[PDB]
Amino acid sequence: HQLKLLKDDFFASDQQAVAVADVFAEHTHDFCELVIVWRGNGLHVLNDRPYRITRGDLFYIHADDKHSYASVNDLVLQNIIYCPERLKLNLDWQGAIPGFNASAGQPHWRLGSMGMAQARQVIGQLEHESSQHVPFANEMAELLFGQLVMLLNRHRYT
């Protein structure tokens, strides 16, 4: 049987385009996500391909990807989930994000110390902007998501 995570269950409203979600059973989605490993190590199985993951790993996941994770030792990761069709800003999302419209040709990247530092700073702010009661929080969140996406594009390597 399939397990498909639903944006209806993972986003605060129909307007919210991005959220910070943070083992995990095998699943697919109807939204996309960026995965960053903050520390420890473990296993990420993406479309039946196993990756031994560790601090600095970055994955670009499309909705139709099926994946699971397992912590081997002290795994800490973060998933930044987003709905491509909900984004309003005129950044070239598809040009900056593998996995935007279909499975990424190269889903797996790494980040150096500076990229991790800048991602950390942006993601921490993005976590605070989840409130659906604070006026225009969704727009603030999208600007932060834009910064993260550009920073990832700037710092990522294979």
Add this chain to the structure above:
Amino acid sequence: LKLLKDDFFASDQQAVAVADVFAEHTHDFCELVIVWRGNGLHVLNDRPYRITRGDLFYIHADDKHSYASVNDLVLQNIIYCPERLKLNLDWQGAIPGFNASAGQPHWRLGSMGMAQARQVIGQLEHESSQHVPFANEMAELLFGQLVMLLNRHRYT
């Protein structure tokens, strides 16, 4: 005396920058002024403001103004060109003085507003480089964030 974007911006493409007695002048670009500490005088369109920590001004290009430090006045000017901003944000909706002189140019920020503004402006300062990939886009995204934060926190 009129300050010109050609002298104040790193390139034709930079839409926003953090600028480095400042005599009376006008500009061909707009700006936000935030006062961090000390105190002084801001004369805007011939109207004198005693300024200090927490003061925020929205300046339009046509505005004529001068400053004078009374006691170690420390401020920053976030300069921007409306015609250069490429991000599809509702800029004029968030920024008084965007299209013409502001009806209310003078605002204040509390302690939390100031800390968040300072954080973003520090980041925006670090995206001045015209070499680093996506610096101009990052500058606009950060200026977008700044402007929304100021909107959230400012009061008269």
